[PDB]
Design an enzyme around this catalytic site. Sequence first.
Site, mmCIF file in Angstrom:
data_model
loop_
_atom_site.group_PDB
_atom_site.id
_atom_site.type_symbol
_atom_site.label_atom_id
_atom_site.label_comp_id
_atom_site.label_asym_id
_atom_site.label_seq_id
_atom_site.Cartn_x
_atom_site.Cartn_y
_atom_site.Cartn_z
ATOM 1 N N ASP A 121 29.909 51.644 20.838
ATOM 2 C CA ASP A 121 31.710 51.784 21.915
ATOM 3 C C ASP A 121 30.914 53.095 22.383
ATOM 4 O O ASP A 121 31.110 54.189 21.048
ATOM 5 C CB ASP A 121 32.570 51.880 21.408
ATOM 6 C CG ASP A 121 33.337 51.576 22.113
ATOM 7 O OD1 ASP A 121 33.401 52.277 23.419
ATOM 8 O OD2 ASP A 121 35.003 51.773 21.654
ATOM 9 N N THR A 159 36.349 49.469 28.423
ATOM 10 C CA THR A 159 35.722 48.832 26.784
ATOM 11 C C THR A 159 35.149 47.666 27.008
ATOM 12 O O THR A 159 34.765 47.018 27.109
ATOM 13 C CB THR A 159 36.425 49.011 24.978
ATOM 14 O OG1 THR A 159 35.997 50.965 25.277
ATOM 15 C CG2 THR A 159 35.348 48.299 24.470
ATOM 16 N N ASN A 180 41.495 47.152 29.973
ATOM 17 C CA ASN A 180 42.302 47.140 29.088
ATOM 18 C C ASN A 180 43.152 46.787 28.855
ATOM 19 O O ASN A 180 43.610 46.042 27.480
ATOM 20 C CB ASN A 180 41.727 48.759 27.942
ATOM 21 C CG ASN A 180 40.593 48.861 27.466
ATOM 22 O OD1 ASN A 180 40.221 47.628 27.483
ATOM 23 N ND2 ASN A 180 40.535 50.288 27.560
ATOM 24 N N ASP A 308 28.047 51.142 25.656
ATOM 25 C CA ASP A 308 29.354 50.486 27.429
ATOM 26 C C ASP A 308 30.013 51.315 28.046
ATOM 27 O O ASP A 308 30.200 51.260 29.302
ATOM 28 C CB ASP A 308 30.514 49.503 26.488
ATOM 29 C CG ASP A 308 31.267 50.895 25.711
ATOM 30 O OD1 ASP A 308 31.155 51.603 25.070
ATOM 31 O OD2 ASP A 308 32.581 49.640 24.867
ATOM 32 N N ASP A 683 34.047 41.641 55.995
ATOM 33 C CA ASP A 683 35.282 41.186 54.498
ATOM 34 C C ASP A 683 36.273 41.864 54.565
ATOM 35 O O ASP A 683 37.169 42.343 54.474
ATOM 36 C CB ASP A 683 34.381 42.341 53.924
ATOM 37 C CG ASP A 683 34.685 41.358 52.618
ATOM 38 O OD1 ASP A 683 34.636 40.400 52.047
ATOM 39 O OD2 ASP A 683 34.525 41.858 51.571
ATOM 40 N N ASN A 685 38.785 39.216 53.588
ATOM 41 C CA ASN A 685 39.506 38.854 52.164
ATOM 42 C C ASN A 685 38.990 39.578 50.760
ATOM 43 O O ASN A 685 38.990 39.465 49.800
ATOM 44 C CB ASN A 685 38.963 36.504 51.915
ATOM 45 C CG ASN A 685 37.398 36.837 51.786
ATOM 46 O OD1 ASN A 685 36.951 38.167 52.013
ATOM 47 N ND2 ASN A 685 37.307 35.397 51.881
ATOM 48 N N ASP A 691 32.593 37.275 55.826
ATOM 49 C CA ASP A 691 33.458 36.332 56.238
ATOM 50 C C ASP A 691 32.502 35.332 57.214
ATOM 51 O O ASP A 691 32.196 35.940 57.886
ATOM 52 C CB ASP A 691 34.282 37.413 56.953
ATOM 53 C CG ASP A 691 35.391 38.296 56.244
ATOM 54 O OD1 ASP A 691 35.126 37.728 55.126
ATOM 55 O OD2 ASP A 691 35.893 38.875 56.840
HETATM 56 O O1 LIG Z 1 32.659 43.290 17.187
HETATM 57 C C1 LIG Z 1 33.483 43.203 18.194
HETATM 58 N N1 LIG Z 1 34.483 44.257 18.241
HETATM 59 C C2 LIG Z 1 34.651 44.369 19.469
HETATM 60 N N2 LIG Z 1 36.121 45.358 19.912
HETATM 61 C C3 LIG Z 1 36.687 45.387 20.810
HETATM 62 C C4 LIG Z 1 37.348 46.056 21.050
HETATM 63 C C5 LIG Z 1 38.080 46.604 19.351
HETATM 64 C C6 LIG Z 1 37.361 45.625 18.926
HETATM 65 S S1 LIG Z 1 33.787 43.832 21.128
HETATM 66 C C7 LIG Z 1 32.893 43.489 19.577
HETATM 67 C C8 LIG Z 1 31.325 42.479 19.576
HETATM 68 C C9 LIG Z 1 30.350 42.671 20.846
HETATM 69 C C10 LIG Z 1 29.086 42.235 20.971
HETATM 70 C C11 LIG Z 1 28.824 41.776 22.009
HETATM 71 C C12 LIG Z 1 29.308 42.237 23.001
HETATM 72 O O2 LIG Z 1 29.074 41.480 24.100
HETATM 73 C C13 LIG Z 1 27.090 42.648 24.189
HETATM 74 C C14 LIG Z 1 27.444 43.135 24.550
HETATM 75 C C15 LIG Z 1 26.233 43.971 24.541
HETATM 76 C C16 LIG Z 1 24.837 42.662 25.266
HETATM 77 C C17 LIG Z 1 25.188 41.523 25.383
HETATM 78 C C18 LIG Z 1 26.580 40.746 25.146
HETATM 79 C C19 LIG Z 1 31.124 41.680 23.293
HETATM 80 C C20 LIG Z 1 31.183 42.030 22.074
HETATM 81 CA CA LIG Z 2 34.713 38.064 52.745
HETATM 82 CL CL LIG Z 3 43.013 49.920 31.852
HETATM 83 ZN ZN LIG Z 4 37.020 54.639 24.129
#
Ligand SMILES: O=C1N=C(N2CCCC2)S/C1=C\c1ccc(Oc2ccccc2)cc1
Ligand SMILES: [Ca+2]
Ligand SMILES: [Cl-]
Ligand SMILES: [Zn+2]
EC number: 3.1.4.39
Length: 804
Positions: A121, A159, A180, A308, A683, A685, A691
């Site tokens: 993250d 995130t 978020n 991310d 576009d 919509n 469209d």
């Molecule tokens: O354990 C976790 N805690 C999370 N939090 C969010 C903020 C608060 C805690 S997200 C999380 C795990 C997680 C792992 C993989 C995910 O999808 C992916 C990512 C990369 C490549 C392909 C697929 C999505 C989520």
């Molecule tokens: Ca459209």
């Molecule tokens: Cl937001």
């Molecule tokens: Zn953050």
Amino acid sequence: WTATSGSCKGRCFELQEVGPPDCRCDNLCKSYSSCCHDFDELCLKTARGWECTKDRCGEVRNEENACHCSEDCLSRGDCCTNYQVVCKGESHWVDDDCEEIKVPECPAGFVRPPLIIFSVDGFRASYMKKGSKVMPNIEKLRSCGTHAPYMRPVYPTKTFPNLYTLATGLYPESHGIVGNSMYDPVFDASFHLRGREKFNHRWWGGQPLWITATKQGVRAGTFFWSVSIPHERRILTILQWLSLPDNERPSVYAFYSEQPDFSGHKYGPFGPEMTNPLREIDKTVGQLMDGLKQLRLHRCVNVIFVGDHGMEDVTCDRTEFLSNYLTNVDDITLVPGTLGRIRAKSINNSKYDPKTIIAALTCKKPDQHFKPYMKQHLPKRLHYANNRRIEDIHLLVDRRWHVARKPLDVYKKCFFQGDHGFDNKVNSMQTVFVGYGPTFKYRTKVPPFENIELYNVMCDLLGLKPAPNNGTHGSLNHLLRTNTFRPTMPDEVSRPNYPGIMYLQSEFDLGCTCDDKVENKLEELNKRLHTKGSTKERHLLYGRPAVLYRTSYDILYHTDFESGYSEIFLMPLWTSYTISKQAEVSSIPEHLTNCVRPDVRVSPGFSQNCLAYKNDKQMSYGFLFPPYLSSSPEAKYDAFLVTNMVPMYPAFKRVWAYFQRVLVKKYASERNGVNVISGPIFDYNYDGLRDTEDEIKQYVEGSSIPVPTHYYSIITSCLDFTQPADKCDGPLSVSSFILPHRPDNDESCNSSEDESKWVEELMKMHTARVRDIEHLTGLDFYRKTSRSYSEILTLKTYLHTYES
Ligand SMILES: O=C1N=C(N2CCCC2)S/C1=C\c1ccc(Oc2ccccc2)cc1
Ligand SMILES: [Ca+2]
Ligand SMILES: [Cl-]
Ligand SMILES: [Zn+2]
Ligand SMILES: *[C@@H]1O[C@H](CO)[C@@H](O[C@@H]2O[C@H](CO)[C@@H](O[C@H]3O[C@H](CO[C@H]4O[C@H](CO)[C@@H](O)[C@H](O[C@H]5O[C@H](CO)[C@@H](O)[C@H](O)[C@@H]5O[C@H]5O[C@H](CO)[C@@H](O)[C@H](O)[C@@H]5O)[C@@H]4O)[C@@H](O)[C@H](O[C@H]4O[C@H](CO)[C@@H](O)[C@H](O)[C@@H]4O[C@H]4O[C@H](CO)[C@@H](O)[C@H](O)[C@@H]4O)[C@@H]3O)[C@H](O)[C@H]2NC(C)=O)[C@H](O)[C@H]1NC(C)=O
Ligand SMILES: [K+]
Ligand code: NA
């Protein structure tokens, strides 16, 4: 309710979650307040720490320990990750020379290379270089595997939208996690980072990777971890899962780290306190790779190190307050921060008006650090409109800044030094990608790509068919040693007509005039050849675009340009022309200022007319091929054909004329010639897709001439600019834009100045991928090149960002 009197004995981190009220032992039971009473004791052991020491070697197994150094631990699959280093003379993975993994080297019973996703993250892209000294494990993955200089997140660079985009390959407007914080008016429900509504599955659209794997018979570890589970325990759990019997063992796994985002918020992206979080991330990577090496999997598993979003310098004193702009501050709800989303506080208030809100927020202060948009006017590259959870009014906030409603929101809700969420082309928001394993390439650098493309690749790595998503499958084939997806070009659906001269001048009653009666065998066979396509190789460099929907259109050839003219929309779908470096810009002669000429190849019934533009006091017209770039005075008459004319607001004609008169020549000079394909986009919509005719909300007054929402141009040249655009032997170079067709220039606060001060800035903000234009037009470009189709798909996903 949960009857937590059951036991996790033998169930620690079970892979199927059991339904209530029976108590759970999976890695998410904490987040639901539903673990069995003994989960901490049995499943979250911590005794003796996470590392073997010399004296623990060969110990008697004590099941209280967090991990083991006894002789049986390899069979049980629960050694500490450094067991072989400390106790069996082995080396850490990071200390080994990296050797090419030409084939998967897996233990017997492994049907496919497992995929392990290591997601971090807030891992800003520049951390790879700036932190390289303290991240030896991550640096070995990067340099020996496949890596990009950066990976582009989706907007908003928050995130949850980006993690779920990674998992699904969808834009947030499509998978539904558009921020978020969200309010869904159909549900009348609110989604928050803290709380239990976010656990409700109705928020989560699309089909994430773990569901796609499960439905196609590929077992998945559970991707999510309760926050209090420490990173060392997550790594050990993944390694324990990899020792399961073949019929029970997952093939795809995910680890998640809340760092370095957590510290980055407190200390800023490059605060001196950020070194230790980067060290600890690397140590966790080292534990995983050491653990894989113990299990003889370090040349079998594909590892993806992926972030991310990035992190930017943001402090409290850099906050804009809507109370300094609006009188009616208390009648709006604002979703605040690095982006702004505004809606009425109460739906029973019919004195609420978005038009007056936007006007009060538009260019009101000289240094204003946010710009208001109706969401359908946001740059199309953001793909952030087509969801009921996205408010009509949006504020694009300048990097390093926040927007808040009132000053009291900031001190009764500085305490932070970093944040993210800004426009996804901002450099500080970029994040990382590394691929390492048998299926990825060896010591390979790939160009930056968007995170929406990863889902297809991860499906490729696991032999899965991807659910429909917004990646372009095959555009990332250059990342892979094997398992590539070999796509075919879509078949053309509508073939064109090739009209000859079929109408006399007097058959047209369009109210158009042109002073063109001033008037050979030499240049009369010549003009016939041009109208039959004799210069089409020069102006149509990559083949004609394929029309991928059912429609009626004509190919029109000219000396200087070629067009596909739609008889349904009464204007070209595309206009293609090449401008060499030596081409000269001329003016529109005085006698031809208002010249519009009937096209004797196209019936009056399928032509625009000048009277409609005369009667429509709001709508003027422009031309797709610019008369300024005509190759000769006689060729300039082609540019005034009624079949080259498109409706344009006078305010937009300022933008368009500057692009056609100044910028095209500048690009031709800088890139050694350019090929240009321009056209309209409808576009209404705002779903990002072309469209149909019955979705057009505005016409030129009194006519069936539809008004485009946008105008595009695709500007292509040779990547090796020592070669002219029309004599290129190798890879191509492209930049494109999708300019909103608006009756004002309120978006550009400096628009009362000369176009040289604001127009190009506007065009850069609306830069686009060729792929974006294909969605919006139903066209398929680059059908006839010497390049491989996968390389062309990469070219179509390229975005020229204009960052430094
Ligand atoms: O354990 C976790 N805690 C999370 N939090 C969010 C903020 C608060 C805690 S997200 C999380 C795990 C997680 C792992 C993989 C995910 O999808 C992916 C990512 C990369 C490549 C392909 C697929 C999505 C989520
Ligand atoms: Ca459209
Ligand atoms: Cl937001
Ligand atoms: Zn953050
Ligand atoms: C990025 O990639 C995605 C994925 O490929 C793509 O999005 C797809 O666009 C398709 C075309 O717009 C659309 O096709 C049909 O949609 C519905 C059925 O959808 C349901 O089933 C699918 C399959 O499982 C679900 O994925 C889908 O989830 C959506 O809705 C959920 C909430 O209800 C939510 O969980 C999820 O996030 C997702 O929301 C997103 O999409 C919807 C649209 O579906 C948006 O409204 C949201 O804002 C959000 O963006 C659904 O559960 C079919 O019924 C459609 O058929 C219409 O239109 C036909 C036209 O040919 C017509 O023949 C039919 O009669 C039917 O018309 C009926 O309804 C009309 C309007 O309601 C009405 O006027 C008429 O009278 C008649 O009653 C579509 O054929 C896909 O659903 C969609 N998938 C996803 C996952 O979004 C994106 O286009 C690209 N983006 C770009 C830029 O390329
Ligand atoms: K007019
Ligand atoms: Na302006």
